[PDB]
Design a protein around this ligand. Structure first.
Ligand SMILES: Nc1ncnc2c1ncn2[C@@H]1O[C@H](COP(=O)(O)OP(=O)(O)O)[C@@H](O)[C@H]1O
Ligand SMILES: Nc1ncnc2c1ncn2[C@@H]1O[C@H](COP(=O)(O)OP(=O)(O)O)[C@@H](O)[C@H]1O
Ligand SMILES: [Mg+2]
Ligand SMILES: [Mg+2]
Lengths: 354, 313
């Protein structure tokens, strides 16, 4: 029937028009709602950075680890908690008393450490560069603090979990993030790619599009596909890892946020560093690191970032906007007393610079 | 013909279903977008509270009122906003402070709800144990009373606190109970009048009554309406103080002395005033700066803003 179809047409043209009109309203609500979300996040980002700056752009923390079941009779020096931020030790045989942004004691969980770190993962997604360092003599807690242990995982694994949850969320704002992972060791001034097997030679060079950012030649830079992929690379890296005690390990995650609708990008790094041991027998990098950090604090003209591989590697995450956490790991025992004191005296130098 | 318009109906069945799916994805996107916007704005407000906590015990907000029903003919000065917290006004006829930074600047279209939203945080602090002073400053005509008390149709801050403040306490009685010594008083010329003599409260509606009492029982408007709300709790001593002040315009010694007194505190001198003693606040205080958008209130606004600025020092 022709009248049937003539009717269906006339009816579809009515419908088609009410939809076309409705879709134009939705679109126009979307456009402004899209605009107010972008701006609101811009504002949330700035309020966040301000809270980080008020707490301090570089912050030092202490963590005395528990004793080991193994040696239930290494004598521990006398530890005394003057407050939540101040700590003192005495040898068994002046006063050794040190202030920090926070002191973590032997029953502080991994979770508790991460609480100091998780806010900075956001700073990295907002486009800032972050350094988390673990410092102190061998035995003192560094590896346990950064990598940790399957039963109680450390900073790095927690960072990854938060990174994927956070990235999932960001899609709802139009941001498509991409992580670039790299793992490397540093020994006697030479870099080693822990994702490679071939022995190759890698130098640190100025970037393509920013003379202040850094570029490492001939390193494996993996674009993470999902957590499973990262999990694999993590595992792999641990595999290729008294040399280990004198090697610095740097895990780096470069967050690369593209917002196509607005054509803005947001790139921030995370630099997770299991430093080498602070014990007197590193000769170059570890000493230069400590100078570089202290110089930052004193607001000095020029800074010898290029006097060492490590300070060169981390240069774009040490000046200016970057934020920096430093976890001083310490062993409670008496035979570590003098070395523990050396460790803690960097805390003294740090806040000696105000 | 049968061929022709059978082609047509198919083509339209496509555009129809095609547009319906696109209407569908839009619908969803919008629902998502609004959720996220809500969520982003909440985090923003929580950070904004943190920032004000960590940097001092004294917040300053500025509210510009919209022109009144009966004032379409009135000439407005030019208002320029740079930030959520930065505002500038220029005279209409084309040296010194002309652009001011506060903790928040509220537009003429700011609801009584949005204003209170920013004070909410300080209320719960009082339960926690602190003394809160909420001042309203400005020239007569500006917004002090409207903002503080409000009007039966769109309630102000003083009432709104009550709502939240009970929402709070039912949460606390869940091994903690709270007594609420209330207080209401005015100040004309150094004279300590009443408005009811403190009266302990035991009900949500009980307030709204004596709240309604003092209101009508109150009054020209060149007098301070203080309103203590002392709170104690036993298993948390504290207070809330809410103040609508006398006009800030040209002659009120108490105000010029209120000013003097605050230069001292921020600078870490009383009570030369009467209000100043009464309010002896370890105490988070907030201040509203009400301002009129009109060109004949220009210099007076600049008086208020420049005063608000010095406060931020
Ligand atoms: N917070 C802690 N809780 C329990 N065990 C810890 C803690 N910190 C370190 N350890 C243990 O102490 C030892 C110290 O080595 P580790 O800190 O992992 O590397 P490094 O000694 O090079 O800093 C490890 O065997 C680890 O099991
Ligand atoms: N945000 C606002 N929205 C609408 N009207 C307002 C607003 N603020 C003040 N007004 C009106 O402007 C007038 C100014 O008086 P008001 O500010 O309430 O008392 P005071 O001048 O003592 O501060 C009132 O009539 C009030 O209703
Ligand atoms: Mg180690
Ligand atoms: Mg009034």
């Amino acid at each position: 029937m022709h009248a049937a179809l003539s009717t269906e047409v006339v009816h579809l043209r009515q419908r088609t028009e009410e939809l076309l009109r409705c879709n134009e309203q939705q679109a126009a609500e979307l456009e402004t709602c899209k605009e107010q979300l972008f701006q609101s996040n811009m504002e949330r980002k700035e309020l966040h950075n301000t809270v980080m700056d008020l707490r301090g752009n570089i912050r030092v923390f202490c963590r005395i680890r528990p004793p080991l079941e193994s040696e239930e009779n290494r004598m521990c020096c006398t530890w005394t908690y003057h407050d939540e931020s101040t700590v003192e030790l005495q040898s068994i045989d002046g006063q050794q008393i040190f202030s920090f942004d926070q002191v973590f004691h032997p029953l502080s969980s991994q979770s508790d450490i991460f609480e100091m770190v998780s806010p900075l993962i956001q700073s990295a997604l907002d486009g800032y560069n972050i350094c988390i360092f673990a410092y102190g003599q061998t035995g003192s807690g560094k590896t346990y603090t950064m990598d940790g242990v399957p039963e109680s995982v450390g900073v790095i694994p927690r960072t990854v979990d938060l990174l994927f949850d956070s990235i999932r969320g960001y899609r709802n704002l139009g941001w498509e993030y991409e992580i670039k992972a790299t793992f490397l060791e540093i020994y006697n001034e030479v870099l080693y790619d822990l994702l490679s097997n071939e022995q190759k030679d890698m130098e640190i060079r100025m970037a393509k599009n920013n003379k202040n950012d850094i570029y490492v030649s001939n390193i494996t830079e993996e674009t993470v596909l999902d957590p499973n992929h990262l999990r694999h690379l993590m595992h792999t890296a641990k595999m290729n890892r008294e040399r280990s005690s004198r090697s610095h390990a740097v895990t780096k995650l470069e967050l690369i946020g593209r917002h196509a609708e607005k054509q803005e990008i947001s790139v921030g790094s995370i630099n997770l560093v299991d430093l080498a041991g602070s014990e007197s027998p590193i000769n170059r990098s570890l000493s230069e690191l400590t100078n570089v950090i202290l110089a930052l604090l004193q607001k000095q003209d020029h800074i010898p970032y290029r006097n060492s591989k490590l300070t060169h590697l981390l240069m774009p995450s040490l000046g200016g906007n970057s934020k920096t956490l430093m976890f001083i790991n310490v062993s409670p025992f008496q035979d570590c007393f003098q070395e523990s004191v050396k460790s803690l005296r960097f805390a003294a130098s740090v806040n000696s610079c105000k």
